[PDB]
Design a protein around this ligand. Structure first.
Ligand SMILES: CNc1cc(C)nc(Nc2ccc(OC)c(OCCCN3CCCC3)c2)n1
Ligand SMILES: CNc1cc(C)nc(Nc2ccc(OC)c(OCCCN3CCCC3)c2)n1
Ligand SMILES: C[S@@+](CC[C@H](N)C(=O)[O-])C[C@H]1O[C@@H](n2cnc3c(N)ncnc32)[C@H](O)[C@@H]1O
Ligand SMILES: C[S@@+](CC[C@H](N)C(=O)[O-])C[C@H]1O[C@@H](n2cnc3c(N)ncnc32)[C@H](O)[C@@H]1O
Ligand SMILES: [Zn+2]
Ligand SMILES: [Zn+2]
Ligand SMILES: [Zn+2]
Ligand SMILES: [Zn+2]
Ligand SMILES: [Zn+2]
Ligand SMILES: [Zn+2]
Ligand SMILES: [Zn+2]
Ligand SMILES: [Zn+2]
Lengths: 272, 271
């Protein structure tokens, strides 16, 4: 009875390396427009990010930064990107290390091997209307394990500002006393529409590029396994989110392994 | 003879490569500076990057209409449909340009985004006969075309005041309390552009991703048609020549030259 309609040829309005279309084959919900699409983190009130170019640790490489003498690699133990820009198979997917990409202070060229996240989105993604979870994001192509997908982009806000945001649905915690969040509620990119999955296929990794202010890592999603075409993308939102939200709604991810469904929570409340 | 001694002085940081040739002498490709493609800071400048402070448009076309708010913040959008300054653009007294930004409703490829889109023309760093390194066009360039930005280290008046080398400074005209770009230590292709008494490019103040009026970004546009091989240059202005004249004199070689040893002698000797 109902057709899949294409309702936006590019929700990023041309701001990404590729267009991100939106389709809806499920209901009458038109293209989401209660937010401003931005491709890189914004600020409302000042974050006082340390941008002093002299504070950048940087490499003195004269090659494409594949030697273990690259200081940038060394700051993360080693450079973790293979030759096609994908995380090495031994990459710690459980506790990813901080990645330091090469920056404007490095001697190397813009096209060295240590610049994956800064080069932006390469895989083809689609915003689509899911059965039970509002909008979601899926792959239009297969994506090998360890490939960079997109960054979690938003408005940088302080601990205190987060405390009083009305909607807490789109917060990402920036990990390291004085702490900050990304809030994608009013300003965000394609990643604000990525759903929680109890069986995730992407992991967030903290990355530094043009600054190395440790209060403000940038959050890069990489696939944690090969992803088949058409699969929904999803990461583990984590307990902070679910401890709060569990009483308003439960997880609809549909996995055998789901630990946040109405069923999982009732089995748990009773196993206690 | 004239050999290519760097394939790209910008190390792939620009949209296009900028080669270095030397057919005049034995000087190697300059390297006493760090090539950057965007302005940098050393000491903190606190640029206002509050997205809510951005004046922005509500267009859902390509921003060609006179109703584009961003266009009006400079009387009119000054760019034709090919991204060139209008013929009637005030080349003597250029107004402030406000390009579209991340707060505008429009698309990234609207018509009000010329400078933020980067270098498009083919430029070359070459060795000149008499003024060290210079920059020249490797193609014809019509009047009103964006060439490159003057990129460097943002610094205060006080800091400029104590800089040993004052050869690479650009004043950011502003209200109260003023800043400079110093391209001495950190710079892009434009640090190599020489002064000409018969100039073929002009600097324009432009705002893009922020609108902190202390820190306009400086875009060079051609002020007439330029032929392949022509040296680019602008008028450095009296402030530079006043300081510099007692050290060296203008070698631009134009009959209009007003800063040569000769021209300076004829004025001292009208006194
Ligand atoms: C309240 N004051 C604060 C203050 C600080 C520093 N952090 C937080 N974090 C936080 C609060 C509520 C959350 O959930 C309702 C939450 O979820 C993070 C994981 C789920 N996100 C959803 C999309 C991006 C990832 C984080 N809240
Ligand atoms: C000393 N304290 C200052 C302080 C401030 C606010 N401005 C300046 N400006 C300045 C000083 C010396 C200069 O020249 C010797 C000069 O040249 C302006 C134009 C020449 N530039 C050369 C490359 C780009 C254009 C500007 N100096
Ligand atoms: C970051 S937004 C994800 C995009 C969201 N689907 C939308 O339509 O905007 C997070 C919100 O999506 C919904 N959501 C995400 N993952 C879910 C899940 N596994 N089960 C149920 N609802 C989920 C909840 O409304 C949650 O607060
Ligand atoms: C911003 S740099 C331009 C690049 C410089 N030619 C170089 O080789 O690095 C300015 C300096 O270039 C030289 N210069 C530029 N225009 C000149 C001119 N018209 N006559 C003589 N020297 C000039 C002077 O040394 C001046 O202080
Ligand atoms: Zn390196
Ligand atoms: Zn590198
Ligand atoms: Zn490096
Ligand atoms: Zn689940
Ligand atoms: Zn507009
Ligand atoms: Zn605009
Ligand atoms: Zn526009
Ligand atoms: Zn002259």
């Amino acid at each position: 009875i109902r057709t899949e309609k294409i309702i936006c040829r590019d929700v990023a309005r041309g701001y990404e390396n590729v267009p991100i279309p939106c389709v809806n084959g499920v209901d009458g919900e038109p293209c989401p427009e209660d937010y401003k699409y931005i491709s890189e983190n914004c600020e409302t009130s000042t974050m006082n990010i340390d941008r002093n170019i002299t504070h950048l640790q940087h490499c003195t490489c004269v090659d494409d930064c594949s030697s273990s003498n690259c200081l940038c690699g060394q700051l993360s133990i080693r450079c973790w990107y293979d030759k096609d820009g994908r995380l090495l198979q031994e990459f710690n997917k459980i506790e990813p290390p901080l990645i330091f990409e090469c920056n404007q202070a490095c001697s190397c060229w813009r096209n060295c091997k240590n610049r994956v996240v800064q080069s932006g989105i390469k895989v083809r993604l689609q915003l689509y209307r899911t059965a039970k979870m509002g909008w979601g994001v899926r792959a239009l192509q297969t994506i090998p394990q360890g490939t960079f997908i997109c960054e979690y982009v938003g408005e940088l806000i302080s601990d205190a500002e987060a405390d009083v945001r009305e909607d807490d649905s789109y917060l990402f915690d920036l990990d390291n006393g004085e702490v900050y969040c990304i809030d994608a509620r009013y300003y965000g990119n394609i990643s604000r529409f990525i759903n929680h999955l109890c069986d995730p296929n992407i992991i967030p990794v903290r990355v530094f590029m043009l600054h190395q202010d440790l209060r403000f890592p940038r959050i890069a999603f990489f696939s944690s396994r090969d992803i088949r075409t058409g699969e929904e993308l999803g990461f583990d939102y984590g307990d902070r989110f679910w401890d709060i939200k569990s009483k308003y709604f439960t997880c609809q991810c549909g996995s055998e392994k789901c630990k946040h469904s109405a069923e999982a929570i009732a089995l748990e409340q009773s196993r206690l």
